[PDB]
Each structure stands twice: as C-alpha cells, then as structure tokens.
Amino acid sequence: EEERSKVDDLRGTPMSVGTLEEIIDDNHAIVSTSVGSEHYVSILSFVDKDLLEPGCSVLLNHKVHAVIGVLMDETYADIGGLDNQIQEIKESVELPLTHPEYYEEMGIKPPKGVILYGPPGTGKTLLAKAVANQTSATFLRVVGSELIQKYLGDGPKLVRELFRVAEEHAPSIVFIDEIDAIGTGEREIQRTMLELLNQLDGFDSRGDVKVIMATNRIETLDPALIRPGRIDRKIEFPLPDEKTKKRIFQIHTSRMTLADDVTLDDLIMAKDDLSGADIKAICTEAGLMALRERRMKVTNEDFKKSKENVLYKKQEG
Amino acid sequence: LYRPALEELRRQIRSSTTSMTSVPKPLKFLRPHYNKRFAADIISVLAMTMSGERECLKYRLVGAGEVAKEWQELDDAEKVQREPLLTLVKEIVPLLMEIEQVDMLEKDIDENAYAKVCLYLTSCVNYVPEPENSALLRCALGVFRKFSRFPEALRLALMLNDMELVEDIFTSCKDVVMLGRHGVFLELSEDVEEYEDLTEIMSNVQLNSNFLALARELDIMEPKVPDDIYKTHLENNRFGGSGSQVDSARMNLASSFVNGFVNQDKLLTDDGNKWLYKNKDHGMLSAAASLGMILLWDVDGGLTQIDKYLYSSEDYIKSGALLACGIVNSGVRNECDPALALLSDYVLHNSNTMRLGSIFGLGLAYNREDVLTLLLPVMGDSKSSMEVAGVTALACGMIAVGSCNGDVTSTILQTIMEKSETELKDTYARWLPLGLGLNHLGKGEAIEAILAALEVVSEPFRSFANTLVDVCAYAGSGNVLKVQQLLHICSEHFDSKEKEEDKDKKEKKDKDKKEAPADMGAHQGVAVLGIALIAMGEEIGAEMALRTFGHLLRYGEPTLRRAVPLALALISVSHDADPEVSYNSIFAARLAAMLRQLAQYHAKKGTLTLCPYHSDRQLMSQVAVAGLLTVLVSFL
C-alpha cells in the first residue's frame, strides 16, 4: 500500500500533459509539446509500452519529466431492386476472414474493399448495403470525416488511432459513410486525406481489415484517390424509379398496420423524390401521431397531416 | 328483490375504477347467473384479473369450493376464449393444476404443449420451485402419455428417472413404429439408474429381445461409428505435423493425447513401436489407454488389439491395458475377473495401478453392490497413492449418481469416517468430496446437506467437503436465496471454497446462461477470474464468451494461461486456428504448450459430462493426475 501510494510526489502538483513522439529500445522515450521539448528518462510503472502506440498524448511533469504513467483518450435480404448489387457487396466484402475454403486457395487477397456511392445518399441505402457485415463481425463503422473536421487540427493521428483499434479488431470491416472531406483548416483536409489515402492503401499493413467508402457522389473523389483508392471493385447505383421506394416502403408497411387506402406514388414522390429517410420519419411520427389517436390504424388524413410537417419543413427554410 | 343486479353493478363500478379485494366479493356472494363483446369485457379481462386477484388473495391468505367453482368457470371460459399463454400463465400459481390441464388438454396439442410446456417449463425450471415442477412432471406424464410426441416424454424421463415411463414409452413406441436414432438419444437421455433398471425389467420381459439387444451396449455407437468413418474424412497433415512438433518429453504426452483422442485413420496408432517405451510412467498409462480410447467399438477387435499389452513385462502396460479394457466398452463387463481377482495386494503391487485402470474403467462401465464390497478393503486400505481412493471414490460415485433421494448409508459413512481417519494428504479431502457429491446427486427432497451440516462440520478440510456437498446439493431450482447467499459467502477468506462453491455457478444456472456472466472478473482475486473462466462452459461459444477469452487469454501465471485453453477449446467445438495462433504469439511454459496443443485436439443434466471436469478442477498438482487427464469421459 505504501509502495503504491508513495509515487504520489511525481503525480502531485508538478504535473503536465504532453505529447510523446516515440519510444526507444534504450528504455528512455522522447516526448514533445507545443514548443517541442524532448526529454528522455528511464520508464517507470503504470505504463504498458506495448499497446501505447507511441505518438499520442501522455502525462508529463514540471520535474525532469520521469514518465509516471499514461492517460488514454433491415438485413441484406430485405431490400429489393439491388439484389445483384447486395450479393455483389455481400460476396465481395464477406470473402475475407469468412468462408475461407474459397479465399485461401485463390491467394489473391486484394486488401482494398469496394467504394460505394449513391445520389440519394443519406446513409439509409448505403447503410442498408453495408449491413451485410453486421451478420458475423465486430461492429466498427467510422462514419465520414466529421470527427476529423469538428476537432482541432491534430491531423491523421486520429486515423492512426482508428487504424490501431482496427488492427486490434481485425475481424471487422471499416465502413465510411457520408464522405464530406472535399465536398463540404481547409488546407489540412488535403493532407489528412492524402495520408488517409497513403495509410489506407497499405503503406505498412496487409490484408487485415477491409475499408468500404460510401458517399453521395462518386465524382467527389479526387483523381489521386482512384488508382490507390479503387483497385478492388467499383459499383453503380441506379435511380430508385419507385421500385427501391416500393420495396423500402413495403418493408415499412410490413411492420405497421395500414391498408391499401394510402396513396403510394404521391408520398414516395411527394416533394421531388425520396427513398426511405423522410418516409421513415413520417412512419415514426405516423406511429406516434397515430398512437396519439389511440388507434393502431393509419388514418388517411393523419398520415398526410403528419406528412405536412416534413413537406413544410424543408420548403419554408 | 333482484339484488344480484345491484351486486353486479357494484362490482362493475368498483371493478371499473379501483379495488384490490372488494371486486370478487359480489361475485362469490352473487352466485353468477343471468363469444360477444360484453361477455369478453366482463368475463375475459374483468374475470381474468378478477379471478387472478381472487385466486392470489385466497391462495396467499388462506392455505373452499367457491374458488374451485370460480377457477373452473374461468378454466372453461378461457377454454372458450382460447388464449392459453396469458390466462394459463396467470392461473399458474393456484392437484388443481393437474385437473386443470387434463381438463383443458383435449384438442389443443401443439398450442398447450409447445407454448404451455415451453414457457411454463422454462419459467418452471427458472423461477417455479421443485414441488410444483413435480406436478408438471406427473401431469405432463398424463397429458403427454395420452398424446403424441414421445421424445418430450423421454425428457420427462430425463427429469423423472422413472422406469414405468420408459416401459410405457417402449410398449407405446413399440406399438406405434428411427430405430437406431431413438436408441442413440434413448441411451443418451437415460442416466445410470434407469438403464440398469431398464436392463433389469427388460432383462425380465422386453417382449421382442430387441430391448436387451438395443439398450444394452454397442447400439448407441453402431449407428455412429461406421457413418463417422464414411461421412467424415480427416487429413494426415495433423498426424504428421501434430505428430512431428512433439518434443521436450511433455509434448510427447501431448502426443499420447494425439493418439488417444485423435478420432478414421489409424496411422499414428501403428507408427512403428517404442513410442510407448520412450514415454514416462503416466505417459505409459495414457499411451496404454490410447488404444482403448480409440476402440469404443469392435469388442472382438478390442480384445485382439489390447491383448498385446496384457500381462506384459511392465506394470503400467498391463494396468493401462486394463484401463483400455475399461474404456473400450461399457456393457461387456467380461474383463473384470482377471483384474478383480488379483486386487488383493494392499501395499504396493501391480494391483494398485490395475486398480486405478480397472476400478476407474469399471466405474465408467458401471451401480452393482459386489463391486462396492470388493472396494471396501480398497477404501479401508488407504494407500499413500492418491488416485486409488481417487478413482475409487469417483468410481463408486459414478455408480451412485442419480439415486432415489440419495443415501446416507455405510458407503459414504464409511468413506467419511475413513476420510477423517487420517488428516494427511489433503488431496484425499479434495477428491473424496467429489465422490460424496456424486452420491448426493439425483436427490429431490433429501436432507443430506443438513445432515452433512450436522456431522461433517469440522476444520476447513471436511468443511470444504461440506461446501462440496453444498455444490452438488444445488443442481438447480428457484432458490435465489442461494444466489444472495452465494454473493454473501463469496467473500470468504478461504481461497478454495470460493473456487468450488463459486465454481458451482456454471452448474446451478447452467440453463439460463444469460445470468452466468457477472462482475466476478473485475475483482483482484484472480482465482475468481478462473472461476468465471471455467464458468464460460461448453456451450456454442458466442461472441461474448470469446470476448471473455480475449482478456482471460492474456495472463502470466501458468494456472490461468493453462486454464484458458481448456474452456477455450471446449466452448468452440478463420476462427478456430486463429486463437491458437494467438497462443503461439503469447508463448512463442510447457504446461501452456501441452494444454494449447491438447486444446487443438480438444477442439477436434447428464452426469457423464458434468463429473469429469468438475473432478478435473484439481489439475494444479504433480504429473500423477496427468495419467487421469486424458481419460476423461465428458468428451463425446
């Protein structure tokens, strides 16, 4: 107890938060800060030195900087209209690490994955395509570079943390949805996306985890992101032409209680066009708003009456 | 004049707004008189909750005919409404349930049987206590005896262990004629009691000679032994490789596990000679018993394959050869005399190791008394060798598993008095309670736990025997007092009754495996982390279990690194060899290597599957137990 509560002098008042650069096999690591102060001291307890993955933020002191510790910081067979494309992504990204009798004899291992896109986007159809991996795999989906741009300009180090947790979580499939890097400071997006491309290509890795890139348009990817970004396979999403809307709305009506009195065409094509997002919203507020009337049946005027909220929402402002 | 109308209106408004006891009184005094909407309103929900609170208040308050007439009127009324699950699950707690079910089970077979027996059997083994489950077994014996779907009545024979049920299902399964399959799970479902009682009443009549033909021996495996050679094909790269990376005089023991539990092909079995000679003494027992473990078929071939090792020049070759004779069969019992007759040596001779293999393999073959009278000078001998009383207590225990409310006779009284005779070699106080608890198995209302709490209460050796009787005395019921008592006594200073008493969790709540994972691993008592590590079990091995093996797999002590591959390979029988490559990354001592390869071969309430590992929980000892490590019978 005394030996555990005696190192409090180092972690006491003279304590700071620095950024370690690398660890040397000579048991003295190198740290840094805003001005880049490099101090090497023999390591102490409470550290792992193996899973630490040097190059992150660590704990420093006002002392000689002896390291006292560290501080860390709807299935594939439900939707219709794209069964060939969903068995294409199923058969394509469910090939590695699953069904190995036809994966190791070929000996190809293209560690790149497919790149999805869709004019509707919204993550509903793309997530419905990427849901094939949720069957038998660890849930891991890095949805876009939103956390890259909403945080301080730390660079691709967060991509290195997601890549090290994806390396410690090899039986997974890294899925990326709503890529808004260049479609939406600004000069750092090109270097963190070029380092995302370099580290994504497998600069110091092999066929461990698959990467599926999904966005709103295939033309948003720069020409640099083509040859080292797409080497496995590309897809093509056609317009829903009320058939993907018919199947998605059929799934939405497979659980709720409603007759054929509700007109389909004007509601799946109410404002301009929409597959599942706001019709899923009016199905949610249709079950809740229909539940307000203490009736499970969907009234012909309450469904369109709740639809007036979404129709008026995106048109007023 | 028409006061039932005013009582009906009074119970209508009092039942309409709120009341807890005043609702059914106008109905029990009203004498109800005088499929519709109103009938469903005042009968279905108002008489469902009405009769529910009347049966609850009159069932918990007093313990008349009014509640019987109202409860049978609800029985017929809900037989017209035809909602079995909700109405039945509400009228469970008010035999009344027997006459109710046989009063309802006329036309609906799959609804009341599948639904009522599914959710009421699951909730009956989870929450309902035993004395009502006995009514489930008797009334289910009735409605399932008069109806079809025999195998669920065979499950009623697994829970009842009655010979009239298997006799009636043999004359009823014989009157209505697969054969070999129902013999397979017939013998798998029956325990030690009703297969010898079955072989004695069927030794009496059997009416076709096919019950003594089928349900004696070799016919649970005669449908599976040839098919497994035909429908499956194993490669030689495991014999050459797994038989090639062996060295250091312990991976050769792992190669005795290769030969013993490698199975189609018999190449490594006859790969020259001197393999058994190069091995150690306990590896000569394991290697001598390997040919017995690979020959659970072809008795005539087993005799001509083990006869070469019989009466050989070495003691462990013939003793392990008698162990092989005990493993090859379980209904032949013809190899008894050549080993049973020579047992009388009593000090150090060959009959002590031939007593290990012959009493152990004979216990696997067997509840005959004569063998126990022959084992009386064995338990009274008390040799310095532990495995003598080890396989003796485990042998007579496996003979006595599933007895009628147990027994406190001079067998366990004799091994308790002779257990407390000398207070040396505590391993006796660690394996004798195993056989004791095996004799305690099969009880339904026995007071043997309190009797042991009266006589056995002593220093923590026989008190550890007492908590072992507490382990085997809690096979499972609705007794959550043992769960709060488990959490209360879980913090005991004694670091072994935590291991066994807390290790009982994988057996008590074995069926409802959703509650087995808990916060036991978050403590600092790494022994409790081993308790959860064993508490994973042998199930399908979902992602949560392997998630627990991801943290339990990485440890420095050889007891946890040695204890992880056993459950890691028993619970899982690009995802099979990958954790083994993880073991290759962790290691590259010898214990975790022999246990990680032995886990490679491991990967590739029946007492036969609950006894060998619960007795195997004492591996943290010398290599003497390693001669018994490979001959476990829990492996199908």
Short mmCIF file of C-alpha atoms in Angstrom, two decimals, chain A:
data_model
loop_
_atom_site.label_atom_id
_atom_site.label_comp_id
_atom_site.label_asym_id
_atom_site.label_seq_id
_atom_site.Cartn_x
_atom_site.Cartn_y
_atom_site.Cartn_z
CA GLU A 1 0.00 0.00 0.00
CA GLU A 2 2.81 2.40 0.88
CA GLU A 3 4.77 1.49 -2.26
CA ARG A 4 1.65 2.19 -4.34
CA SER A 5 0.84 5.45 -2.51
CA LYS A 6 4.44 6.72 -2.37
CA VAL A 7 4.81 7.73 -6.04
CA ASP A 8 2.26 10.48 -5.43
CA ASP A 9 5.09 13.04 -5.27
CA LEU A 10 5.68 12.71 -9.02
CA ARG A 11 1.98 12.79 -9.98
CA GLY A 12 1.23 15.53 -7.44
CA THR A 13 1.17 19.28 -8.02
CA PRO A 14 4.06 19.42 -10.58
CA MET A 15 2.21 17.58 -13.35
CA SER A 16 1.55 18.40 -17.01
CA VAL A 17 0.08 16.87 -20.17
CA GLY A 18 2.49 16.42 -23.07
CA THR A 19 2.67 14.54 -26.37
CA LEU A 20 5.09 11.63 -26.68
CA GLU A 21 6.82 11.16 -30.05
CA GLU A 22 8.39 7.69 -29.94
CA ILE A 23 9.77 5.08 -27.53
CA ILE A 24 13.37 3.91 -27.91
CA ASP A 25 14.55 0.39 -27.04
CA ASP A 26 17.01 2.03 -24.61
CA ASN A 27 14.10 2.41 -22.11
CA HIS A 28 14.11 6.22 -22.49
CA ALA A 29 11.29 7.65 -24.61
CA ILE A 30 11.10 11.05 -26.33
CA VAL A 31 8.19 13.42 -25.69
CA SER A 32 7.16 16.77 -27.18
CA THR A 33 4.92 19.78 -26.53
CA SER A 34 3.76 23.00 -28.19
CA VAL A 35 7.39 24.18 -28.32
CA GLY A 36 8.72 20.65 -28.79
CA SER A 37 10.54 19.79 -25.56
CA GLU A 38 12.38 16.46 -25.83
CA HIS A 39 13.21 14.77 -22.51
CA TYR A 40 14.36 11.15 -22.18
CA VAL A 41 14.08 9.43 -18.79
CA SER A 42 14.01 5.77 -17.80
CA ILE A 43 10.48 4.37 -17.78
CA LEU A 44 8.50 3.62 -14.62
CA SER A 45 5.47 1.55 -13.63
CA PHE A 46 1.80 2.04 -14.63
CA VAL A 47 2.77 2.14 -18.33
CA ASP A 48 2.20 -0.59 -20.92
CA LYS A 49 4.84 0.38 -23.55
CA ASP A 50 3.29 -2.22 -25.89
CA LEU A 51 -0.28 -1.13 -26.66
CA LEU A 52 0.61 2.53 -26.02
CA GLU A 53 1.29 3.11 -29.75
CA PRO A 54 3.82 5.95 -29.32
CA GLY A 55 2.94 9.24 -30.95
CA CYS A 56 -0.04 10.26 -28.77
CA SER A 57 -0.64 12.48 -25.74
CA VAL A 58 0.96 11.34 -22.47
CA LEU A 59 1.46 12.68 -18.94
CA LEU A 60 4.41 14.96 -18.13
CA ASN A 61 5.63 16.89 -15.09
CA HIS A 62 7.41 20.09 -14.10
CA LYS A 63 10.23 17.79 -12.91
CA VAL A 64 12.94 16.09 -15.01
CA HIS A 65 9.93 14.52 -16.80
CA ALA A 66 10.21 10.97 -15.49
CA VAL A 67 7.21 9.18 -17.02
CA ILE A 68 4.95 8.21 -14.11
CA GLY A 69 2.03 6.94 -16.20
CA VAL A 70 -0.12 7.30 -19.29
CA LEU A 71 -3.61 8.67 -19.94
CA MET A 72 -5.68 7.33 -22.83
CA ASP A 73 -8.06 9.49 -24.86
CA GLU A 74 -33.06 -4.31 -42.28
CA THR A 75 -30.86 -7.17 -43.48
CA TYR A 76 -29.17 -7.91 -46.81
CA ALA A 77 -32.19 -9.94 -47.99
CA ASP A 78 -34.88 -7.40 -47.02
CA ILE A 79 -34.49 -4.56 -49.54
CA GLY A 80 -35.18 -5.17 -53.22
CA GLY A 81 -34.19 -3.69 -56.56
CA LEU A 82 -30.45 -4.19 -55.98
CA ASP A 83 -30.25 -7.88 -55.04
CA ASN A 84 -27.40 -8.40 -57.51
CA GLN A 85 -25.51 -5.42 -56.07
CA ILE A 86 -26.15 -6.50 -52.48
CA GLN A 87 -24.95 -10.03 -53.24
CA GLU A 88 -22.06 -8.32 -55.02
CA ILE A 89 -21.04 -6.42 -51.89
CA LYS A 90 -22.03 -9.45 -49.79
CA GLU A 91 -19.91 -11.81 -51.89
CA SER A 92 -17.20 -9.13 -52.21
CA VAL A 93 -16.58 -8.00 -48.62
CA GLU A 94 -17.77 -11.24 -46.97
CA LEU A 95 -14.98 -13.08 -48.84
CA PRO A 96 -12.07 -12.28 -46.47
CA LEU A 97 -11.99 -13.84 -42.99
CA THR A 98 -15.32 -15.58 -43.73
CA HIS A 99 -15.96 -18.64 -45.91
CA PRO A 100 -12.23 -19.49 -46.12
CA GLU A 101 -12.39 -22.58 -48.36
CA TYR A 102 -12.71 -20.30 -51.42
CA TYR A 103 -10.47 -17.48 -50.13
CA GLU A 104 -7.08 -19.00 -49.28
CA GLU A 105 -6.77 -21.36 -52.26
CA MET A 106 -7.03 -18.46 -54.72
CA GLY A 107 -4.35 -16.44 -52.92
CA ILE A 108 -5.35 -13.01 -54.22
CA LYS A 109 -6.16 -11.00 -51.06
CA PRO A 110 -6.97 -7.55 -52.53
CA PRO A 111 -6.95 -5.54 -49.27
CA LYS A 112 -8.89 -2.60 -50.68
CA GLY A 113 -12.64 -3.22 -50.48
CA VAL A 114 -15.41 -1.70 -52.57
CA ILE A 115 -16.28 2.00 -52.81
CA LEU A 116 -20.00 2.78 -52.55
CA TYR A 117 -21.93 5.89 -53.58
CA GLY A 118 -25.50 6.99 -54.16
CA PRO A 119 -27.29 10.11 -55.41
CA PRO A 120 -29.87 9.86 -52.58
CA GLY A 121 -27.20 9.01 -50.03
CA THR A 122 -28.45 9.91 -46.53
CA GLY A 123 -26.82 6.72 -45.17
CA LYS A 124 -30.05 4.72 -45.35
CA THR A 125 -29.45 2.86 -48.61
CA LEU A 126 -25.67 2.84 -48.12
CA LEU A 127 -26.09 1.56 -44.56
CA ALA A 128 -28.54 -1.00 -45.96
CA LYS A 129 -25.74 -2.13 -48.29
CA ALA A 130 -23.12 -2.19 -45.52
CA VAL A 131 -25.47 -4.06 -43.15
CA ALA A 132 -24.28 -7.36 -44.66
CA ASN A 133 -21.19 -7.16 -42.43
CA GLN A 134 -23.26 -6.97 -39.23
CA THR A 135 -24.13 -10.68 -39.55
CA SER A 136 -20.93 -12.11 -38.02
CA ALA A 137 -18.33 -9.41 -37.30
CA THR A 138 -17.44 -6.77 -34.73
CA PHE A 139 -19.39 -3.52 -35.10
CA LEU A 140 -16.97 -0.83 -36.32
CA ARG A 141 -18.11 1.99 -38.62
CA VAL A 142 -16.23 5.29 -38.92
CA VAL A 143 -18.97 7.42 -40.50
CA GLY A 144 -17.16 10.02 -42.59
CA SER A 145 -14.51 12.55 -41.61
CA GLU A 146 -16.94 14.50 -39.41
CA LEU A 147 -14.88 13.91 -36.26
CA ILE A 148 -11.76 14.89 -38.24
CA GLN A 149 -13.12 18.35 -39.10
CA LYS A 150 -15.05 19.11 -35.89
CA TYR A 151 -11.90 18.60 -33.78
CA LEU A 152 -8.65 20.53 -33.54
CA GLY A 153 -6.19 20.22 -36.42
CA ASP A 154 -4.43 17.18 -34.97
CA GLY A 155 -4.17 15.63 -38.44
CA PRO A 156 -4.28 11.94 -39.34
CA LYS A 157 -3.33 10.78 -35.83
CA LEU A 158 -7.00 10.01 -35.15
CA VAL A 159 -6.96 7.93 -38.34
CA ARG A 160 -3.94 6.18 -36.82
CA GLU A 161 -5.93 5.52 -33.64
CA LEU A 162 -8.86 4.13 -35.62
CA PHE A 163 -6.33 2.09 -37.61
CA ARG A 164 -4.68 0.72 -34.46
CA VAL A 165 -8.05 -0.18 -32.94
CA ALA A 166 -8.98 -1.68 -36.31
CA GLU A 167 -5.72 -3.64 -36.12
CA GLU A 168 -6.59 -4.78 -32.60
CA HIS A 169 -10.08 -5.53 -34.02
CA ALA A 170 -9.03 -7.37 -37.18
CA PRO A 171 -12.31 -9.39 -37.57
CA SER A 172 -14.14 -6.21 -38.61
CA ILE A 173 -14.92 -4.12 -41.70
CA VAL A 174 -14.18 -0.39 -41.51
CA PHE A 175 -17.16 1.32 -43.17
CA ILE A 176 -17.11 5.01 -44.13
CA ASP A 177 -20.36 6.83 -44.92
CA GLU A 178 -21.07 10.42 -46.00
CA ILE A 179 -17.57 11.41 -47.10
CA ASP A 180 -17.69 15.21 -46.77
CA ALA A 181 -13.95 15.92 -46.84
CA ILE A 182 -13.74 17.95 -50.07
CA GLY A 183 -17.46 18.12 -50.86
CA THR A 184 -18.15 20.48 -47.95
CA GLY A 185 -8.43 24.13 -41.79
CA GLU A 186 -9.35 23.67 -45.44
CA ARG A 187 -5.72 23.11 -46.47
CA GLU A 188 -5.36 20.35 -43.86
CA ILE A 189 -8.14 18.26 -45.42
CA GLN A 190 -5.94 17.58 -48.46
CA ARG A 191 -3.00 16.37 -46.36
CA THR A 192 -5.10 14.30 -43.94
CA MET A 193 -6.94 12.84 -46.94
CA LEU A 194 -3.65 12.16 -48.73
CA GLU A 195 -2.36 10.49 -45.57
CA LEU A 196 -5.72 8.73 -45.28
CA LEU A 197 -5.05 7.51 -48.83
CA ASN A 198 -1.44 6.50 -48.14
CA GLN A 199 -2.28 4.68 -44.90
CA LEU A 200 -5.45 3.26 -46.45
CA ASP A 201 -3.53 1.76 -49.39
CA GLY A 202 -1.47 -0.37 -47.00
CA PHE A 203 1.79 1.54 -46.70
CA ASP A 204 2.77 -0.50 -43.61
CA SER A 205 -0.03 -3.07 -43.45
CA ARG A 206 -1.51 -6.11 -45.19
CA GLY A 207 -4.90 -7.74 -45.64
CA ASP A 208 -6.13 -7.26 -42.07
CA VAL A 209 -9.32 -5.17 -42.35
CA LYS A 210 -11.49 -4.13 -45.29
CA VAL A 211 -12.40 -0.50 -45.99
CA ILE A 212 -15.74 0.39 -47.61
CA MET A 213 -16.00 4.02 -48.72
CA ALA A 214 -19.53 5.38 -49.20
CA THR A 215 -20.52 8.93 -50.13
CA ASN A 216 -23.14 10.96 -52.02
CA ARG A 217 -21.34 11.04 -55.39
CA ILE A 218 -18.51 9.04 -56.96
CA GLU A 219 -17.23 12.26 -58.58
CA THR A 220 -16.37 13.74 -55.17
CA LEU A 221 -13.22 11.60 -55.02
CA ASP A 222 -10.17 13.35 -56.44
CA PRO A 223 -8.29 11.68 -59.32
CA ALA A 224 -5.49 10.89 -56.87
CA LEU A 225 -7.97 8.78 -54.86
CA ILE A 226 -8.64 6.46 -57.83
CA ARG A 227 -5.60 4.30 -58.59
CA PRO A 228 -4.51 3.75 -54.94
CA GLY A 229 -8.10 4.04 -53.69
CA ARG A 230 -10.01 1.75 -56.05
CA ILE A 231 -8.12 -1.40 -57.06
CA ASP A 232 -10.65 -4.00 -55.90
CA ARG A 233 -14.06 -3.21 -57.44
CA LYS A 234 -16.45 -0.33 -58.08
CA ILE A 235 -20.25 -0.26 -58.01
CA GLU A 236 -23.06 1.66 -59.72
CA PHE A 237 -26.31 2.75 -58.07
CA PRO A 238 -29.20 3.47 -60.45
CA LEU A 239 -32.15 5.73 -59.75
CA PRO A 240 -34.76 4.20 -57.40
CA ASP A 241 -37.58 4.63 -60.01
CA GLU A 242 -40.26 3.82 -57.37
CA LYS A 243 -39.00 0.21 -57.14
CA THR A 244 -36.43 0.75 -54.40
CA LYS A 245 -39.03 3.09 -52.90
CA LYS A 246 -41.66 0.37 -53.38
CA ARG A 247 -39.52 -2.22 -51.58
CA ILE A 248 -38.41 0.11 -48.78
CA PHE A 249 -42.00 1.29 -48.27
CA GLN A 250 -43.04 -2.37 -48.39
CA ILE A 251 -40.64 -3.05 -45.51
CA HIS A 252 -42.04 -0.03 -43.65
CA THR A 253 -45.56 -1.43 -44.18
CA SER A 254 -44.52 -4.98 -43.24
CA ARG A 255 -44.47 -3.98 -39.55
CA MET A 256 -47.13 -1.27 -39.27
CA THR A 257 -50.89 -1.78 -39.60
CA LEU A 258 -52.26 0.04 -42.64
CA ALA A 259 -54.48 -0.92 -45.57
CA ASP A 260 -54.04 -0.05 -49.26
CA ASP A 261 -56.09 3.15 -48.88
CA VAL A 262 -52.89 5.21 -48.52
CA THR A 263 -51.66 6.51 -51.87
CA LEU A 264 -48.07 5.44 -52.52
CA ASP A 265 -46.91 7.46 -55.54
CA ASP A 266 -47.52 10.98 -54.23
CA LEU A 267 -45.86 10.14 -50.89
CA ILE A 268 -42.77 8.38 -52.24
CA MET A 269 -42.56 11.21 -54.81
CA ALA A 270 -44.15 13.94 -52.70
CA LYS A 271 -41.79 16.91 -52.97
CA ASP A 272 -39.26 15.79 -55.59
CA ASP A 273 -38.06 12.25 -54.74
CA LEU A 274 -37.17 10.26 -51.61
CA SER A 275 -36.48 6.59 -50.86
CA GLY A 276 -36.53 5.91 -47.13
CA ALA A 277 -35.32 8.79 -44.96
CA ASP A 278 -38.22 11.22 -44.54
CA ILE A 279 -40.77 8.50 -45.26
CA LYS A 280 -39.17 6.65 -42.35
CA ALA A 281 -39.53 9.90 -40.41
CA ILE A 282 -43.24 10.15 -41.26
CA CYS A 283 -43.56 6.46 -40.40
CA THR A 284 -42.08 7.16 -36.96
CA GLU A 285 -44.24 10.24 -36.35
CA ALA A 286 -47.07 8.32 -38.05
CA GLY A 287 -46.85 5.55 -35.46
CA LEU A 288 -46.51 8.12 -32.67
CA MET A 289 -49.03 10.59 -34.09
CA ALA A 290 -51.38 7.72 -34.92
CA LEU A 291 -50.80 6.46 -31.37
CA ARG A 292 -51.98 9.87 -30.13
CA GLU A 293 -55.43 9.00 -31.51
CA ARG A 294 -55.46 5.71 -29.53
CA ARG A 295 -55.93 3.82 -32.81
CA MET A 296 -53.41 1.48 -34.43
CA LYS A 297 -54.96 2.01 -37.88
CA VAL A 298 -53.29 4.63 -40.08
CA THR A 299 -55.85 7.32 -40.91
CA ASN A 300 -55.79 8.68 -44.46
CA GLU A 301 -55.80 12.27 -43.14
CA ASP A 302 -53.43 11.81 -40.18
CA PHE A 303 -50.66 10.30 -42.33
CA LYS A 304 -50.70 13.17 -44.83
CA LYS A 305 -51.34 15.60 -41.97
CA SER A 306 -48.12 14.43 -40.30
CA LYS A 307 -46.54 14.50 -43.77
CA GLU A 308 -47.36 18.22 -43.99
CA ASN A 309 -44.77 18.83 -41.26
CA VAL A 310 -41.92 17.33 -43.29
CA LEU A 311 -43.21 18.79 -46.57
CA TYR A 312 -43.37 22.24 -44.94
CA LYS A 313 -40.10 21.86 -43.01
CA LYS A 314 -37.61 21.61 -45.89
CA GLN A 315 -39.59 24.08 -48.03
CA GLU A 316 -40.02 27.00 -45.60
CA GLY A 317 -36.37 27.25 -44.53
#
